[PDB]
Each structure stands twice: as C-alpha cells, then as structure tokens.
Amino acid sequence: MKESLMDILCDPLDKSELELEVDEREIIEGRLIGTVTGEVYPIEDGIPNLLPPDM
Amino acid sequence: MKESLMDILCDPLDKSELELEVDERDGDEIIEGRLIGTVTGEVYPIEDGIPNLLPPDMR
Amino acid sequence: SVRDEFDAWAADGRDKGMEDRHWHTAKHALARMPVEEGDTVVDLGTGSGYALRALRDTKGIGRGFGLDGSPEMVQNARAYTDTDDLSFLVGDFDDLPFDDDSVDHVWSMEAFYYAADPHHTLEEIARILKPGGTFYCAVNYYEENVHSHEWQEHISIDMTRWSHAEYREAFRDAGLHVAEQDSIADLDIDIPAATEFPTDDWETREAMVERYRTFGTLLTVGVAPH
Amino acid sequence: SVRDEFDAWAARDKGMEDRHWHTAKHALARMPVEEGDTVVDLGTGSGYALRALRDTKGIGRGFGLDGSPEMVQNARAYTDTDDLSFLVGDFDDLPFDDDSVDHVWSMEAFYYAADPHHTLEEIARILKPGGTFYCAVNYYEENVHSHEWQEHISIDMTRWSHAEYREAFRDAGLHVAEQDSIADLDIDIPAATEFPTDDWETREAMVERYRTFGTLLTVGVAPHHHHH
Numbered sequence: 001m002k003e004s005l006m007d008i009l010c011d012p013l014d015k016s017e018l019e020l021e022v023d024e025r026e027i028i029e030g031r032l033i034g035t036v037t038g039e040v041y042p043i044e045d046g047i048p049n050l051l052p053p054d055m
Numbered sequence: 056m057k058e059s060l061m062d063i064l065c066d067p068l069d070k071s072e073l074e075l076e077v078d079e080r081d082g083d084e085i086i087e088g089r090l091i092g093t094v095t096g097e098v099y100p101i102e103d104g105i106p107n108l109l110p111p112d113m114r
Numbered sequence: 115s116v117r118d119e120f121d122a123w124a125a126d127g128r129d130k131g132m133e134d135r136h137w138h139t140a141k142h143a144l145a146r147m148p149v150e151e152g153d154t155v156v157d158l159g160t161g162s163g164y165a166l167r168a169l170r171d172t173k174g175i176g177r178g179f180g181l182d183g184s185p186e187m188v189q190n191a192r193a194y195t196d197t198d199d200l201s202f203l204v205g206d207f208d209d210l211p212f213d214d215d216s217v218d219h220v221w222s223m224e225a226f227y228y229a230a231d232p233h234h235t236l237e238e239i240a241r242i243l244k245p246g247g248t249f250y251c252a253v254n255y256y257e258e259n260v261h262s263h264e265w266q267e268h269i270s271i272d273m274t275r276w277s278h279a280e281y282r283e284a285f286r287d288a289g290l291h292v293a294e295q296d297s298i299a300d301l302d303i304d305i306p307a308a309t310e311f312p313t314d315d316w317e318t319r320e321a322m323v324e325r326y327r328t329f330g331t332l333l334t335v336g337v338a339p340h
Numbered sequence: 341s342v343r344d345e346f347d348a349w350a351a352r353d354k355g356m357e358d359r360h361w362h363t364a365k366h367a368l369a370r371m372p373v374e375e376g377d378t379v380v381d382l383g384t385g386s387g388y389a390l391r392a393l394r395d396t397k398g399i400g401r402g403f404g405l406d407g408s409p410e411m412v413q414n415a416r417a418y419t420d421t422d423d424l425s426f427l428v429g430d431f432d433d434l435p436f437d438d439d440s441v442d443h444v445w446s447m448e449a450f451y452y453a454a455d456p457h458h459t460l461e462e463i464a465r466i467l468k469p470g471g472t473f474y475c476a477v478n479y480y481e482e483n484v485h486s487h488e489w490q491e492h493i494s495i496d497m498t499r500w501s502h503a504e505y506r507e508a509f510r511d512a513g514l515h516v517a518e519q520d521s522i523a524d525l526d527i528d529i530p531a532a533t534e535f536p537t538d539d540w541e542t543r544e545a546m547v548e549r550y551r552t553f554g555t556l557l558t559v560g561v562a563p564h565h566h567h568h
C-alpha cells in the first residue's frame with residue numbers, strides 16, 4: 001500500500017490515529033499501530049490487515 | 056386545481072403568500088377565481104381550474 | 115403575452131408526438147426515482163403531462179403539479195388527465211411559484227435546457243425541494259450528443275448546451291449534491307437493418323445507434339441539501 | 341467466518357467478476373465520480389470495480405476492503421497501479437476516518453454484514469457530506485430465486501425487500517436518491533427444450549431472474565449535519 005493512501009486510515013476499534021512502522025518499501029512489509037489502543041495491524045505483501053483484533 | 060394543493064403555492068415574484076378568491080368551485084376543485092399577491096398585489100387568474108402563475112411581464 | 119414554438123406544438127399534436135418519443139427513455143428514469151406513495155412531485159415543462167400520470171400510476175404520488183410556460187400545453191395536459199390529484203399550472207422556470215422546502219421531488223424531461231438562466235432555475239429547484247428530495251434532470255440536447263447540436267437551428271429559444279461535467283458542476287454550484295449521472299439508451303425506437311439506410315432522418319445505422327444507444331438521454335440526479 | 345466462507349471463492353474470484361460485471365458495469369457507470377475522487381469498495385472480491393472506476397471515471401484513490409486475506413492478495417495481483425490499494429477489514433468497523441471518502445461501492449456483499457444497519461451508519465460516517473453509497477445486490481426479497489441461497493451459505497444473510505433497503509438507508513441518515521433493477525442481458529438463456537438445468541426448473545424462471553428482476557441497486561447520499 002502507498003504510504004500516502006494511509007492518511008485516512010484509522011484504528012478499526014475506536015477510529016483513532018495510527019502510527020506507521022516500515023520494514024520493506026509503496027509499503028510492502030511493516031505495521032500500523034493504534035495510538036490509543038496499542039493494537040498492531042500488520043502490513044504483509046503490501047496489504048494491511050485492519051480487522052478488529054478478535055477477527 | 057384543488058384548493059388543498061394551493062397550500063404550497065406562492066407569488067412567483069417574491070415568494071410571498073397568495074390570497075385566494077373563488078368565483079366557481081366544485082368541492083375542493085377551484086374552477087374560476089384568482090390568486091392575489093399579498094405584497095405585490097399581482098393578480099394570477101385561475102381559468103377553468105388552471106392557475107396562470109407566470110410573472111405579470113409574461114402575460 | 116408572446117407566442118412561441120411551444121404554443122404551436124400544443125395546437126398541432128406535437129405534445130403527443132413528444133410524449134411517444136420521450137417515453138422511450140423517460141420510463142427508465144421515472145422507474146428509478148425514489149418517489150414514495152403520497153409524495154408531492156413537480157414536473158417542470160410538463161408538455162402532455164405524461165410523466166405525472168406515470169408517477170401516479172406506478173408510484174402512487176399524492177399530489178402532482180405540472181408546470182409549463184405554454185397555456186395551451188397545460189390545457190392539453192389537463193384534458194389528457196382524468197384525476198384531480200394531478201394539477202396543472204402556467205409558470206416560468208425563472209421563478210417557481212412554490213414555497214421553500216415544499217416539494218418531495220422535481221422531474222424535468224427535455225425542457226431544462228430552455229431555461230433563460232439555468233443556474234437560477236437550479237437554485238429555485240434546490241429552494242423548493244425538501245432536504246433529501248431529488249431533482250431528475252433528463253435531456254437529449256447536450257455537448258457529447260453531437261447529433262443534437264443541429265436542434266438549435268430549428269428553434270428560436272437560446273438553449274444551454276452543457277457537457278456531462280458541466281451539468282454536475284452546475285448542480286453543485288446551485289447547492290445540489292450529485293447522486294447519479296447516467297446515459298439512458300432508447301431500446302424502443304426502431305433502428306432498421308444497415309441496408310435500409312439512408313433513411314429520412316439518418317445517413318447510416320452507425321449514426322442512429324450512436325445517438326440512441328451510445329449517447330441516449332442524459333440523466334443527472336440532484337439531491338437537495340439541508 | 342468470512343475468510344472460511346470466501347477463501348474457496350478466492351481459489352473463482354474471476355468467475356464472480358465475469359458474472360457480476362453483467363450488471364455491475366451499468367451501476368458503476370451511474371456513479372457521479374469526479375476525476376481524482378477517493379472510493380472505498382466494500383467486499384472487493386477481485387477488485388474489478390475499482391479498476392473499472394479508475395479506467396472509465398478517473399478516480400484518484402481506491403481502497404478495496406475484504407474480510408478474506410486471499411481475496412485481497414488476488415485483487416492486488418490483478419491490479420497494475422498503486423493508486424488502488426487493498427486491505428483486510430470487516431463491514432462492522434470501517435477503518436477510515438469520518439468524512440474522508442467521496443463514494444462507497446458494494447456489489448454482492450452487503451447482505452453478508454453481521455449488523456447491516458450498523459454497516460450503513462459506518463458508511464454514512466466515512467462518506468463526506470454529498471458523497472454516495474452504491475449498494476448493488478442479487479440476494480433480496482423480490483428475487484424469489486435467491487431465497488434458497490441461504491441453504492448453501494454458513495453466514496447469516498440479510499434478506500431485505502426494495503422498501504426495506506430504502507427504509508434502512510434513511511434510518512442510517514442516508515438520503516435515497518435512486519433505486520432500480522438492472523437486468524442481466526448477457527447470460528445465455530437456453531431454449532425451453534434444454535430445461536431443467538442444474539439451477540432452473542423452467543426457462544420462465546431463468547428469464548424472470550435475469551431479464552426481469554436482475555440486480556437491485558439502491559443509491560444513498562450522505563447528508564451534512566442537520567437538526568433532529
């Protein structure tokens with residue numbers, strides 16, 4: 001996923017801002033972390049997984 | 056035109072209220088009469104049930 | 115009072131001829147309108163009044179107003195309509211005689227582009243519509259439909275020729291949200307075999323197909339804001 | 341679960357695209373997209389709707405959300421631009437900011453939502469005021485032939501009539517702008533002699549399914565804040 005596209009993404013749990021961590025970069029591998037919840041949403045093969053944790 | 060449908064009509068010039076005068080009716084149906092602008096004084100005739108609500112400059 | 119082409123069409127049967135041709139695409143635009151039973155609808159430039167009769171028959175509208183600038187046109191529409199739930203009036207697109215937020219939906223087919231001040235007419239429609247109410251604006255004269263350009267040579271009224279994008283921008287500028295814009299094909303008109311061309315109206319089958327299938331009727335749907 | 345139910349459809353995603361395109365092409369063509377608009381595609385499947393909107397209407401940013409990780413891996417593999425992105429998500433909690441999306445599209449997915457009324461409220465939330473939701477479905481009350489679909493699906497589906505979709509949109513705060521049936525004219529209907537087929541007992545039923553009922557489309561518009 002293009003880093004610029006992440007500007008409107010939010011934590012699925014409470015709709016708060018996310019923090020981006022990059023491992024391979026167009027982001028291929030990394031994570032989006034909830035600034036309020038601490039939840040970690042992984043980005044794998046350019047695809048963020050933004051399901052609520054329990055899913 | 057039914058008098059019950061005239062509740063939403065207004066003077067086309069300034070959107071003010073119209074006064075209805077009836078000369079001939081059939082129940083709710085107004086057949087002859089006029090709608091008079093309460094502010095402009097313009098007279099919009101109702102002729103065989105059809106109001107002519109064109110601005111006066113077009114009549 | 116000055117007579118124009120529309121007054122002549124009302125006297126010579128062209129009101130009924132327009133109904134028969136326009137119904138081919140109007141039926142599809144009317145079918146998709148989100149009109150509920152009991153709603154109040156205004157038909158701007160009603161002609162024969164067929165669109166209100168169709169909305170009464172298919173959607174159960176409570177009140178209908180057919181507005182036209184031609185007294186003869188509305189006298190004909192009234193004569194063609196056997197219910198008093200549909201009313202007709204003479205009026206002009208530049209100043210609509212309805213209160214603010216009094217109408218659930220506004221329909222107009224093959225008429226909007228005759229408005230003297232289209233931007234003001236759009237503002238008037240947004241004014242009379244209740245919030246969330248729609249304006250269904252269907253036209254066959256528009257920029258992309260190259261076959262319609264010559265229509266201006268056959269009528270003395272200065273017509274607005276807008277593209278698809280210009281209709282969307284004008285709606286926004288007037289305060290309407292744009293919900294839909296579609297090209298409605300005419301699937302009713304007879305398009306003869308290619309060997310039957312030229313016909314009286316078309317040089318080739320390709321030109322006729324482009325007019326009625328590729329371009330067809332432009333429908334732009336506006337929604338009145340709160 | 342969503343990934344359990346739809347992973348076999350990702351092993352067939354192109355087959356869904358080919359069938360659904362017959363009506364989706366007409367619904368997509370109606371969308372009032374301006375060049376550069378941001379669109380969210382809920383239950384993207386192969387992602388074809390985003391690619392069609394970029395190719396025909398010039399959307400600027402697209403997000404294809406799906407609860408199946410295999411489905412969005414496929415959708416990304418079929419896409420030749422980074423302006424269209426894909427993510428795993430769920431219809432009950434959309435991971436987009438308030439008023440950040442110009443339009444939302446969904447075809448053949450909405451009725452799998454666990455709480456469809458809450459999904460509509462989430463769509464109204466993420467849409468900018470004046471933005472649209474195009475909801476296209478083949479599983480709905482009037483399409484009598486679709487009722488049996490629940491028998492081969494493990495997810496509890498929502499079966500609403502045309503009127504129920506309009507009422508639910510209004511209850512979520514969306515204004516209903518249009519509602520229509522879009523016929524599928526592309527699917528071949530054999531001669532009456534060829535019946536019954538695996539799906540149809542009579543030709544009349546197949547014609548009714550595709551040429552008469554077709555796909556239901558309901559269009560909603562997100563409002564600005566207003567008095568309640």
Ligand SMILES: Nc1ncnc2c1ncn2[C@@H]1O[C@H](CSCC[C@H](N)C(=O)O)[C@@H](O)[C@H]1O
Nearest residue numbers: 120132136159161182183206207223225228
């Ligand atoms: N400025 C104006 N105010 C009111 N009516 C107007 C108008 N300009 C044109 N009209 C009316 O708009 C109609 C255009 S012809 C279309 C008629 C009908 N809607 C149909 O689909 O067949 C005519 O009846 C004409 O008298």
Ligand SMILES: Nc1ncnc2c1ncn2[C@@H]1O[C@H](CSCC[C@H](N)C(=O)O)[C@@H](O)[C@H]1O
Nearest residue numbers: 346356360383385406407430431447449452
């Ligand atoms: N609750 C939910 N959250 C997210 N995605 C869901 C979902 N329920 C179903 N889906 C997804 O919605 C899609 C339904 S199949 C339709 C795919 C595509 N829109 C097409 O027209 O072909 C599947 O890809 C499925 O995984």
